Design a protein around this ligand. Sequence first.
Ligand SMILES: CCCCCCCO[C@H]1O[C@H](CO)[C@@H](O)[C@H](O)[C@@H]1O
Length: 158
Amino acid sequence: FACKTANGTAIPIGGGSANVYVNLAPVVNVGQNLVVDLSTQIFCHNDYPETITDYVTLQRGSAYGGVLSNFSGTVKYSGSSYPFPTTSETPRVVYNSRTDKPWPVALYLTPVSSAGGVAIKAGSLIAVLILRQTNNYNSDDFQFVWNIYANNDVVVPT
Ligand SMILES: CCCCCCCO[C@H]1O[C@H](CO)[C@@H](O)[C@H](O)[C@@H]1O
């Protein structure tokens, strides 16, 4: 079980961390959702599906910078929605394929009442998401740490 990003970076068997760089809608109004779809950025696979079943959760997601300050968040994990920043670990998604496949996570972020102007700055850390991986084979319990960075400013009109 390993993962890779669209940016070309990767995290190998056993876990670790990597940086993810996302383009964001440059203008977002109060009452609108800014979407950060990591499912197009983060992909994982099972290295031995002939024998082993891999289990994957979103263990925890934290908001940083302008996302923590200026937005109200929901995270969608495999069709289900949760508070973001997260209050609990999600149920498991099953990975039974060697073809690299999306980690099904999306952030839905809507401006708070006090947001206005540049609510997210380019190059700033906006989130950390921890993918947790186990299996039905042994005692492996690994963390894949995704550091999410803004590629561009996001403006909330006033
Ligand atoms: C002839 C025995 C081969 C033994 C191969 C074990 C491979 O383990 C890796 O790949 C497994 C399948 O993705 C993961 O469940 C496990 O955590 C680790 O990432």
